Amino acid sequence: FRTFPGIPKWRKTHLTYRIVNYTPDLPKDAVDSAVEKALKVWEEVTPLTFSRLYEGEADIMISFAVREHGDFYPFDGPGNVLAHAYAPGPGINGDAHFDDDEQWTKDTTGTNLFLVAAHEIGHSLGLFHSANTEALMYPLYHSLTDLTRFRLSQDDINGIQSLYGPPPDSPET
Amino acid sequence: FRTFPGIPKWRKTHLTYRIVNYTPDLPKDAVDSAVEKALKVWEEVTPLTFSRLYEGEADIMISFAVREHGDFYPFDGPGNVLAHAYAPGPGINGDAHFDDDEQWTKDTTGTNLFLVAAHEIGHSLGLFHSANTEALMYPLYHSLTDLTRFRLSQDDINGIQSLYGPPPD
Numbered sequence: 463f464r465t466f467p468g469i470p471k472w473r474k475t476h477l478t479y480r481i482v483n484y485t486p487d488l489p490k491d492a493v494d495s496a497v498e499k500a501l502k503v504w505e506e507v508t509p510l511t512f513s514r515l516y517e518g519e520a521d522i523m524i525s526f527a528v529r530e531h532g533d534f535y536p537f538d539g540p541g542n543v544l545a546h547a548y549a550p551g552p553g554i555n556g557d558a559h560f561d562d563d564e565q566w567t568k569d570t571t572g573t574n575l576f577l578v579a580a581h582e583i584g585h586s587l588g589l590f591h592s593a594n595t596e597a598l599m600y601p602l603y604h605s606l607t608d609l610t611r612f613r614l615s616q617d618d619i620n621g622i623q624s625l626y627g628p629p630p631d632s633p634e635t
Numbered sequence: 636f637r638t639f640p641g642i643p644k645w646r647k648t649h650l651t652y653r654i655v656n657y658t659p660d661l662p663k664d665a666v667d668s669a670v671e672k673a674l675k676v677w678e679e680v681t682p683l684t685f686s687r688l689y690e691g692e693a694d695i696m697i698s699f700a701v702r703e704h705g706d707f708y709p710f711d712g713p714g715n716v717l718a719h720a721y722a723p724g725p726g727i728n729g730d731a732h733f734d735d736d737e738q739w740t741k742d743t744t745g746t747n748l749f750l751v752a753a754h755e756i757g758h759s760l761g762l763f764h765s766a767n768t769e770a771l772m773y774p775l776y777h778s779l780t781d782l783t784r785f786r787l788s789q790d791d792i793n794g795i796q797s798l799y800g801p802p803p804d
């Protein structure tokens with residue numbers, strides 16, 4: 463694992479999230495679930511919880527974005543970069559942007575929304591890019607079939623738990 | 636009616652559109668529906684036609700947007716500016732953005748998506764604001780209950796025919 467410069471992490475354990483808008487590609491439900499599920503993955507192995515806002519501002523603001531969208535970092539069209547997100551902190555920090563010139567998918571067809579959402583929630587949570595290829599925080603989106611063999615790697619566990627520790631109801635091996 | 640400076644138009648009657656993203660506020664089909672209704676209202680009086688692109692850049696790109704977005708013209712929060720659009724031409728020209736710090740509704744309980752989409756597409760097609768109270772291109776939002784009576788005013792027709800002509804026959 464890596465982290466960001468001098469350990470940007472959150473100070474509180476209950477975070478908020480808003481999905482600011484929706485993709486042409488999937489129905490709203492598929493979006494939601496992928497997000498619910500991406501949060502869950504980090505929840506499961508730490509003391510953090512999340513909760514959903516329909517209006518106002520949230521720690522993690524989640525949106526779909528084409529090209530120029532309002533930050534300092536425009537997207538590149540179909541291909542290359544698939545998404546980007548921001549380290550802990552106020553405002554734009556915490557926040558997560560999905561390239562809609564990709565094809566977001568519920569399975570393995572185009573770009574998997576869950577897989578990616580997980581990766582970029584690693585960013586909003588304080589993790590950077592891993593060296594470990596087998597880790598979710600490696601900067602490549604890999605050629606996959608089985609989404610049931612989504613488990614985080616040990617590197618991932620190790621990095622999010624060095625930030626936040628393990629869950630309160632959890633034993634340690 | 637009124638038009639833009641140096642009369643910007645489309646030099647082509649078959650126009651393309653893309654709904655670039657979707658609002659939390661509404662069902663997706665209620666978005667789509669309000670779009671093709673806003674399009675239709677202008678199509679019924681000219682030789683224009685629309686088709687929907689799902690990829691690529693289309694002539695009229697339609698999107699939802701909050702504060703600072705793709706352009707030099709941030710949205711403003713709840714109320715005031717509801718949406719905006721660019722006169723005919725390439726790029727962002729032709730394109731229509733919507734302030735998602737409104738509540739878009741299919742009815743008149745919040746901000747009616749059809750109504751605003753229609754006004755805005757008027758802009759995308761070459762019309763500036765009208766001096767006519769009864770006109771769709773008049774700059775003023777009514778919270779207009781009776782959509783049930785909705786007509787393009789004769790002004791709106793005059794102005795859009797002056798650009799593109801009436802229907803073929």
Ligand SMILES: COCCN1CCCC[C@H](NC(=O)[C@H](CC(C)C)[C@H](CCCO)C(=O)NO)C1=O
Binds near residue numbers: 544547601
């Ligand atoms: C489908 O194409 C797969 C190969 N591709 C396409 C070829 C370029 C790289 C690419 N990676 C990304 O765009 C990711 C995102 C991933 C890992 C989801 C980025 C940008 C990296 C450079 O800064 C990211 O890590 N954001 O946090 C990617 O996974």
Ligand SMILES: [Ca+2]
Binds near residue numbers: 540544561
């Ligand atoms: Ca891209």
Ligand SMILES: [Ca+2]
Binds near residue numbers: 520521552554556557
């Ligand atoms: Ca934030």
Ligand SMILES: [Ca+2]
Binds near residue numbers: 486487562563565566
């Ligand atoms: Ca897409």
Ligand SMILES: [Ca+2]
Binds near residue numbers: 724726
């Ligand atoms: Ca355009």
Ligand SMILES: [Ca+2]
Binds near residue numbers: 710712716717736737
């Ligand atoms: Ca507004």
Ligand SMILES: [Ca+2]
Binds near residue numbers: 660
């Ligand atoms: Ca809204």
Ligand SMILES: [Zn+2]
Binds near residue numbers: 527533
């Ligand atoms: Zn961005």
Ligand SMILES: [Zn+2]
Binds near residue numbers: 581582585591601
């Ligand atoms: Zn990344």
Ligand SMILES: [Zn+2]
Binds near residue numbers: 705
């Ligand atoms: Zn704009």
Ligand SMILES: [Zn+2]
Binds near residue numbers: 754755758764774
């Ligand atoms: Zn206007």
